Amino acid sequence: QLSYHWQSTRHTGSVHPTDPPNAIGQQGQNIRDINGWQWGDRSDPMSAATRVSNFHIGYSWPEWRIHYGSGGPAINPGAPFSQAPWSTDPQVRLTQGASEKAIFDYNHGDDDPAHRDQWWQNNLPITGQTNWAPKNAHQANLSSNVPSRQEFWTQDYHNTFGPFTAVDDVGIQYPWG
Amino acid sequence: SGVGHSTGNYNNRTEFYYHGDEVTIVCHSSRHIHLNMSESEEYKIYDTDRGPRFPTDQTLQGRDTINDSYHAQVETPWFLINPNSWGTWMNPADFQQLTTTCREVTLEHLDQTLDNIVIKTVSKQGSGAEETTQYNNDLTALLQVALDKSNQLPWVADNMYLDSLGYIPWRPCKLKQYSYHVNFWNTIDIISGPQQNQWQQVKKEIRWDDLQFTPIETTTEIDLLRTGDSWTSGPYKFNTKPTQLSYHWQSTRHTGSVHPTDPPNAIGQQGQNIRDINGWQWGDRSDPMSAATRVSNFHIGYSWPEWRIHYGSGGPAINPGAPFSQAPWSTDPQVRLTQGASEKAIFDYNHGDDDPAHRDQWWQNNLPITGQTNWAPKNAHQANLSSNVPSRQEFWTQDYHNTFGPFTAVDDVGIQYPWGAIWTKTPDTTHKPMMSAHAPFICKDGPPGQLLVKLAPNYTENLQTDGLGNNRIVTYATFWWTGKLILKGKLRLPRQFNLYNLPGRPRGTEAKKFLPNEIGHFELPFMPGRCMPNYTM
Amino acid sequence: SGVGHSTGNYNNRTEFYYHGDEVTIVCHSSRHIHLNMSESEEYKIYDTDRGPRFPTDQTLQGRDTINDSYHAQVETPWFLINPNSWGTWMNPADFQQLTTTCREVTLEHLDQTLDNIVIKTVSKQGSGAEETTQYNNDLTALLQVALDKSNQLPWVADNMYLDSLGYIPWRPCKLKQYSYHVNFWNTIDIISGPQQNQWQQVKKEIRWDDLQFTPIETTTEIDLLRTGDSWTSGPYKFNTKPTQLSYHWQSTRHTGSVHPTDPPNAIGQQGQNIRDINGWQWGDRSDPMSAATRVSNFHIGYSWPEWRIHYGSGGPAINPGAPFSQAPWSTDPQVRLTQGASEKAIFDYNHGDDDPAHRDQWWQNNLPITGQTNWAPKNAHQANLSSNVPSRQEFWTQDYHNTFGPFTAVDDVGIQYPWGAIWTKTPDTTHKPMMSAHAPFICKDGPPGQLLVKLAPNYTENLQTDGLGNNRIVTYATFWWTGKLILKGKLRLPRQFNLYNLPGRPRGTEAKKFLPNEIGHFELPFMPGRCMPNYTM
Amino acid sequence: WWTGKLILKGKLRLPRQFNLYNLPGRPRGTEAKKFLPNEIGHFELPFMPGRCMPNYTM
Amino acid sequence: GNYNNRTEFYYHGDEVTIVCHSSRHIHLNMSESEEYKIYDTDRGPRFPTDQTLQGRDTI
Ligand SMILES: CC(=O)N[C@H]1[C@H]([C@H](O)[C@H](O)CO)O[C@@](O)(C(=O)O)C[C@@H]1O
Ligand SMILES: CC(=O)N[C@H]1[C@H]([C@H](O)[C@H](O)CO)O[C@@](O)(C(=O)O)C[C@@H]1O
Ligand SMILES: CC(=O)N[C@H]1[C@H]([C@H](O)[C@H](O)CO)O[C@@](O)(C(=O)O)C[C@@H]1O
């Protein structure tokens, strides 16, 4: 594929019912009492986050997994995605989208002989499969009630690849790939 | 047809044809549609608020950020006609017939028409006291019809908000405006602050530099129809796979060779597991030859960080685990165990609730599907599997790992009769999903084209650029949608000696609930779609 | 079609077809047109006032007489449907596609239709307080359509006032009345009085003895259409030349043989022009062998008394010099250098401004076109060209002469995407113009015929000769224009090793400006039409 | 001298939207001179993404 | 043989054909030995000699 995909699960399918804004500064207003399919036993808060979907875009992963096989440690790669939605400070470099780095030289497209050049490929356009493991959570039940402090977990680092998952590969990386 | 000739008739019959092992189900559906004038003639792009219940503070430590509805969309003057839901095509007795006589079913063909277009304008004479309303036919007014057959438009016809045509043939249907998401970022950090117990917004905005805007008029050709005019979609052919009409009760402990047992000798006695036997066992385990450590070829079901919350770009979303019944763990019926990837349909009068002005709801917990039951917190793992029992360390519980793997066999949810979607579009990504979390049929090529309709604007004599709905005669339309959906099943024949439990209404329900009352209100029953036991192996 | 059958459909798609070196672009456009009743049924001849800002005195010494709008015209009850503008035929992504994949493009074919005619009358009941307005279909009323295929009518469809059909497919369009100039004299002397610093009118009047009056009814046949009726133009075939989709950066100093140079030896060093060389030089100049005095075969660009004001019969008019970029002379971005024959489009909501009630404007300065840059005040001429530098006398600056001549090579402006005209009529004179100052295509034979429409008068029961609009039932119409414009391009393939700058929005603009906002307002971007560098020689 | 011939088969890309695309070009923070020969003939090749343009997933 | 580094594009309908010609001038020295050799290596730069980083640098 020569295209990048911006759609996450929240970008796909039916849009949450909204009444339009009436003027230039106004935002749409999510409708409160609506019908639909929701996950678990959840009807009171009809919300886009708990809307059922057919598939799921992207998966989480123990990012920068180090395998340590026979023959030594090796990176077990997670899926490629952009960290641009989480970035904020451009000084700190978030490497976790399975980004790659090409180190190259004069014959491979560096300008200066005797010094190697390098390009960090962070995959900035690929969003919507963005899946930073530490930012996820899981809860015991999904209902009209908010779970307590226990019953809610963060920073798990599980692999969420499964039979419902749709995910893109990195694609062509032109000079060095 | 001119003005005084009908352009079509009404067929809501379902027809069954049995030949050999093959059954052909022809579903005719006809609906009378009420269409108003579009609230504006403009395409609009805007984002929204968070929606009800999203936190304003850290009282719940961001656990309630799962309530986020934030999104950005491109409003479109067009209305969507979506027949993607069982109930729009089959009444309860028809679907009962389907799930009684068929072991599996596939989609084969879809045809659609629109006809008998009536467009009226409303006139209001007199002042408030003697205000009189006149409804006049506008014989030259136009209805606009766009069918996107090439699937060039964003696909939003998944029925997840139950936008589908209504389920009961004698009531009128209304339509929802077509809208789709644009590119936005909705990143929320739930581990922000010291102690990592605070939620903070990271990026919430529309991505204009990247945004995609695809109006109907420049993407598809549009048919213009007057009152004597009719419209047909032409044939659509499904390319999909059959869905199973059975539920599977077999776990890994129910499958394959049975542990050697000597029979009981009398009525109250139980079988006695044989002690010294041969066989294959996992690890280096021979002394305790036991069914639990018997080797198997495959594994039924997988565990999962159940009710996984993803928090992607665009906000949190449930990453669904596999469907299964919590009935084996239930005990107390008061507590509701939601963890089998259960779903809940919230619906209304046109979608099968009895009372107008109040919505009804059905919690689909998938009680028959056991044996892929895999509640994460109940599992364990141990360092070694041997004749020795591992110590306290070397044994772990309550892990919440994903156990999906190359040896895994697992069922999808199957048809959910009244409210469930029928088909779904395949996402265009490098790795296509292996199975669907809700819709039983995945269209390998494009799904049926989205049928979009809009009443052409009927202007007053003074057309001002500053005006919106002022220079627009108040106009509405009624017309008739008809459709034909062909299904192909395989016949179901008895595989057992004893009696089956045949499909019927849900357990705790009485027939009167699904029958018209004094004023004509009734509900449609949930029907499982995997209604009967079958062997997995 | 009778009364309840549509006479046409809606296609706004643009289609691209690539075969070998040839590209075929099929532009479908459909517009919903709102037409009122003509303000009078009479042809009128009248002249005007001077217009805003024309001097009443000698405060500015007549320099502000350039503000003259005076003219005489023959008002005509007819309305013009003019599709002569990019934007009426192509959306921004389509035109981006065109200018990315095509090195040049020609016009090939034009087809037009009118259909789905709706004619309504307005009734007003009750006194002011309870005044109620009724809109009734008049099923027997007539629309008049005249296409002048023989070009017997004065051609006024040049889009210079932006009278063209609107650019965004989902909005309605209104039409301007057809009118054309009659013979008048508007001579203003700007060197009048002692000191020759005073402006005085010489002749300002209509030339009745010579005047030409050509009404529609006696010049062309007229089609009469009721609501069930449709109209087609038939095929029109363009005879024109291709327009270049590239901009040229090469001046005479950029072309041909390079001055002999020895290379730099290291990163900070510059080449060193060789001193003693052979070659051809202008005049008797050999000692200073220099690139400036190198002989060439041709000369790129010409100078001109820039912003020439003609003051003909009928008043002052700009005599345009060649288009070029002032970017090489710019420096301060605050001061705006207008002298490259730059143009300015002033436009409104239907023509691609976002805000109703306020007009927007784009100054087209032609920044990529350099190398024909020829600012008159910066040139010079010298008596002789030799090894000797001429004295103070023998050297002249700031001349403002016209340097167009037989050795001159010069580009026209090219396509100006949103607002620019497409074609133009060739003036019928002994010497045909060599090139066009604005419209990219010059029709060698007649241009597409002017499409004129007028709603037939709907009279009351009492027809009085003294009456005008009293004996005329208030009547308006809506109908649908469709058109098909076929373009033939030549494919653009990379001529260089390095990356091109591909067509996109203008420099200082953000994508949101060209995307619908909350209420649906947006602008269309200017696209240059010469978007990419190419070699001249 | 090595010579080679590699044949690729693509599918054409046509506009799926009304508005303007961002067309492939050099990376964001880079200037064209970096990818052009200098006085002594040294230059770099630009990274090009290979997924360069938005498309709908569903 | 001759030298062709041209890339050629051919557009027909929905199909594009891209023909990439590449030519390279190759410099080849004599092999440093004529023998096949089997050997293992050292750890490489930055691999820990001690437990200062608790083995995090064993990557
Ligand atoms: C080809 C090239 O010049 N690469 C430059 C990269 C890229 O700009 C980024 O890696 C892109 O993500 O930046 C560096 O400083 C770096 O971070 O290693 C090295 C170098 O200056
Ligand atoms: C269609 C219908 O009437 N649904 C009823 C459901 C179902 O009995 C269960 O959800 C099945 O699991 O029960 C409810 O009380 C509920 O829990 O939301 C609502 C409603 O009374
Ligand atoms: C379409 C549009 O928005 N046009 C803008 C122009 C252009 O940026 C320049 O004219 C380009 O040369 O700038 C103005 O301020 C101006 O100078 O008249 C008006 C307006 O803001």
Numbering used by the authors:
A (entry chain k): 276 to 452
B (entry chain i), C (entry chain h): 33 to 569
D (entry chain k): 512 to 569
E (entry chain k): 40 to 98
Q: What do the authors of the reporting publication say about this deposited model?
A:
BuV1 is a member of the Protoparvovirus genus of the Parvoviridae family. Similar to all known parvoviruses, BuV1 assembles into a T = 1 icosahedral capsid. The gross capsid morphology includes pores at the 5-fold vertices, protrusions surrounding the 3-fold axes, a depression region at the 2-fold axes, and a wall separating the depressed regions near the 2- and 5-fold axes. The VPs have an eight-stranded β-barrel motif and an α-helix that form the core of the capsid, which is characteristic of all members of the Parvoviridae.
